[PDB]
Amino acid sequence: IPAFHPGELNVYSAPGDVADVSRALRLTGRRVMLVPTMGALHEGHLALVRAAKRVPGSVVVVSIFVNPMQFGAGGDLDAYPRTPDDDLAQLRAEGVEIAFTPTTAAMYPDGLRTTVQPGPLAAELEGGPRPTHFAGVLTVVLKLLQIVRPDRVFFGEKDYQQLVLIRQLVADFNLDVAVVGVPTVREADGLAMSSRNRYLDPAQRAAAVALSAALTAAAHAATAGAQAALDAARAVLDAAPGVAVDYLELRDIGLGPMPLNGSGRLLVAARLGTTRLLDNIAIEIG
Amino acid sequence: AIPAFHPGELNVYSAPGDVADVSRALRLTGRRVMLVPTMGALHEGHLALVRAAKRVPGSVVVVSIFVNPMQFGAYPRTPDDDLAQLRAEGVEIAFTPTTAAMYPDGLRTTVQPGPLAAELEGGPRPTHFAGVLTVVLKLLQIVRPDRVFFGEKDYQQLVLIRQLVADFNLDVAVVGVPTVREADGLAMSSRNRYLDPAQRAAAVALSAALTAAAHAATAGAQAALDAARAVLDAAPGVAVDYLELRDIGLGPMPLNGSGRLLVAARLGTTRLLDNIAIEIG
Numbered sequence: 001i002p003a004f005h006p007g008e009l010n011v012y013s014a015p016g017d018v019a020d021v022s023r024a025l026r027l028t029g030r031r032v033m034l035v036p037t038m039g040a041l042h043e044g045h046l047a048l049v050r051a052a053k054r055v056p057g058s059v060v061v062v063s064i065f066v067n068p069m070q071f072g073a074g075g076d077l078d079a080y081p082r083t084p085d086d087d088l089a090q091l092r093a094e095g096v097e098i099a100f101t102p103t104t105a106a107m108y109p110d111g112l113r114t115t116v117q118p119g120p121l122a123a124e125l126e127g128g129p130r131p132t133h134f135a136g137v138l139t140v141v142l143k144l145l146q147i148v149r150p151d152r153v154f155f156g157e158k159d160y161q162q163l164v165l166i167r168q169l170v171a172d173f174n175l176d177v178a179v180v181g182v183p184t185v186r187e188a189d190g191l192a193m194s195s196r197n198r199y200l201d202p203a204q205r206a207a208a209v210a211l212s213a214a215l216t217a218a219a220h221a222a223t224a225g226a227q228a229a230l231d232a233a234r235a236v237l238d239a240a241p242g243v244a245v246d247y248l249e250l251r252d253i254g255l256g257p258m259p260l261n262g263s264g265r266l267l268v269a270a271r272l273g274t275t276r277l278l279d280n281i282a283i284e285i286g
Numbered sequence: 287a288i289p290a291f292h293p294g295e296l297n298v299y300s301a302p303g304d305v306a307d308v309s310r311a312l313r314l315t316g317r318r319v320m321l322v323p324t325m326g327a328l329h330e331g332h333l334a335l336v337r338a339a340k341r342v343p344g345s346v347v348v349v350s351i352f353v354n355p356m357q358f359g360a361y362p363r364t365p366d367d368d369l370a371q372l373r374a375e376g377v378e379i380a381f382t383p384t385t386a387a388m389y390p391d392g393l394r395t396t397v398q399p400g401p402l403a404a405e406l407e408g409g410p411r412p413t414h415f416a417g418v419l420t421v422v423l424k425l426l427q428i429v430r431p432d433r434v435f436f437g438e439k440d441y442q443q444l445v446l447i448r449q450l451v452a453d454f455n456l457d458v459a460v461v462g463v464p465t466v467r468e469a470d471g472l473a474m475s476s477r478n479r480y481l482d483p484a485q486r487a488a489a490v491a492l493s494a495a496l497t498a499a500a501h502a503a504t505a506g507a508q509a510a511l512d513a514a515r516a517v518l519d520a521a522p523g524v525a526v527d528y529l530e531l532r533d534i535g536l537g538p539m540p541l542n543g544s545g546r547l548l549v550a551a552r553l554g555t556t557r558l559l560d561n562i563a564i565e566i567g
């Protein structure tokens with residue numbers, strides 16, 4: 001067991017160190033909670049941390065690892081925001097006891113060898129133009145789950161397709177962990193918090209409110225049916241200056257091979273300049 | 287409530303959730319869970335895996351019996367007899383799930399093996415090892431054993447499972463068990479039942495070629511290869527698919543040192559495989 005200081009933030013980079021500490025804690029009765037992140041922490045991540053912290057007898061592990069495998073090109077990987085010092089400052093302020101910060105070499109000593117092949121959902125929506133993105137996400141999450149062996153793992157609803165794919169991973173591989181989805185944290189005007197929001201200039205920040213406005217308009221319009229909901233959302237997006245919609249789709253909640261029937265999810269992706277923003281909302285039809 | 291478990295008896299569970307709960311409960315009580323994955327039709331080869339698991343102090347042996355559709359190209363079943371053999375061996379847990387219980391959502395998320403899966407046995411069956419690693423990963427997650435046992439006869443399968451464990455950071459020890467052989471050296475295999483007399487006599491060439499190579503190896507890699515090739519060339523009706531010397535992880539064989547020699551051949555409609563440790567020099 002590496003040194004562990006209860007009540008303080010303990011940072012471990014070696015997978016073996018966090019694995020040993022987690023096992024030891026689990027053996028003494030504490031329930032290990034895992035919050036996987038790629039760093040650049042904001043209030044949305046803190047909500048995941050808080051959800052984890054409130055589980056009785058919990059010890060929280062926040063992993064910070066910008067996973068190369070889920071980036072389609074080195075350019076995107078190099079562009080990903082990195083603010084390590086602020087991240088750890090936020091974790092200490094939150095009372096987090098463990099941050100797991102592995103190196104790329106420790107996670108991929110053999111490059112891409114055995115990997116996770118997601119189901120068909122990975123080739124749609126976000127996966128359409130980025131066919132290997134979700135295999136990258138599921139492979140790293142599977143590894144993080146095996147290293148930490150948490151009782152529960154927390155993900156934000158903002159990246160809803162990712163959340164669904166992780167539930168598929170857990171069910172399909174018989175993983176003994178509970179997946180907890182946490183509601184999206186939003187700015188005062190409705191904008192979904194995201195590390196990519198820092199790339200919106202003042203005008204784009206103003207126009208970006210259209211995504212959340214379109215989704216909530218659609219959710220209330222839905223009493224009149226799917227067409228009314230989608231058209232309300234389209235009208236709001238169309239009134240927004242400089243917002244180029246990638247997709248706007250209403251799907252069954254599992255996003256799978258099932259038609260929309262009562263409870264659904266409305267998902268949107270749009271570009272403001274070079275920044276691609278995502279958002280989604282629960283929708284009840286009729 | 288945890289399902290019933292009667293020590294010293296053969297406890298059979300078909301529900302993944304059930305064997306998962308019992309295994310977890312037993313691990314807590316001071317037992318080390320050993321997993322032996324099988325597809326039924328048990329013979330002495332499987333029994334060697336079972337005995338290997340039983341030897342571990344404090345062991346509780348879990349033998350899974352599941353004909354995995356995913357590893358078949360897109361099979362003998364003797365349930366009662368298999369369970370009798372396990373009972374005779376002192377095995378306490380048999381896990382016998384249905385295809386629907388293992389694949390409730392069909393093939394959705396699966397394991398994609400590294401490039402080794404496309405070589406050797408992967409040539410004729412390119413989706414075979416994805417099927418194997420997917421079901422083995424699931425069995426490891428359901429049973430959570432301390433050690434998992436596989437026969438060295440399927441060496442490439444053994445190596446790919448070692449890759450799976452390392453690559454996904456699985457906390458389990460993979461144990462390779464030496465190949466059980468008939469008196470003349472033929473690796474035991476359920477498929478040997480298909481060989482007619484002439485084919486069964488010719489089939490001794492695989493093991494004879496490997497052992498000849500292992501001993502010829504003091505003279506170098508080429509000598510080992512040529513010796514094995516000569517033995518196979520002395521047998522009629524043996525269509526060699528491959529004869530390769532690789533390092534122990536199945537990469538390229540080093541200048542000298544340890545390695546593995548693998549062979550596969552077709553005798554009529556039956557494909558046979560075998561392999562052996564080789565020390566070069």
Ligand SMILES: Nc1ncnc2c1ncn2[C@@H]1O[C@H](COP(=O)(O)CP(=O)(O)OP(=O)(O)O)[C@@H](O)[C@H]1O
Nearest residue numbers: 037038044155156158159184185192193194195196
């Ligand atoms: N506004 C928000 N509310 C709740 N959870 C959020 C959130 N934004 C992100 N998350 C969650 O935080 C976890 C880590 O995601 P990250 O990609 O590290 C941050 P990000 O805000 O999504 O940056 P990004 O826009 O560059 O992808 C995910 O489970 C994600 O869904």
Ligand SMILES: Nc1ncnc2c1ncn2[C@@H]1O[C@H](COP(=O)(O)CP(=O)(O)OP(=O)(O)O)[C@@H](O)[C@H]1O
Nearest residue numbers: 324325331436437439440465466473474475476477
């Ligand atoms: N002769 C042998 N010695 C040791 N282990 C063996 C063995 N033959 C098979 N095994 C092991 O038994 C397990 C189950 O493999 P199976 O394919 O189900 C049996 P099989 O005898 O190889 O049948 P087959 O001829 O239909 O391929 C594997 O771990 C395999 O390597």
Ligand SMILES: CC(C)(CO)[C@@H](O)C(=O)[O-]
Nearest residue numbers: 036037038067137140159
């Ligand atoms: C789940 C995750 C931490 C895997 O790297 C990443 O995809 C993210 O930030 O959501």
Ligand SMILES: [Mg+2]
Nearest residue numbers: 158159194195
């Ligand atoms: Mg994200």
Ligand SMILES: [Mg+2]
Nearest residue numbers: 440475476477
């Ligand atoms: Mg076999």
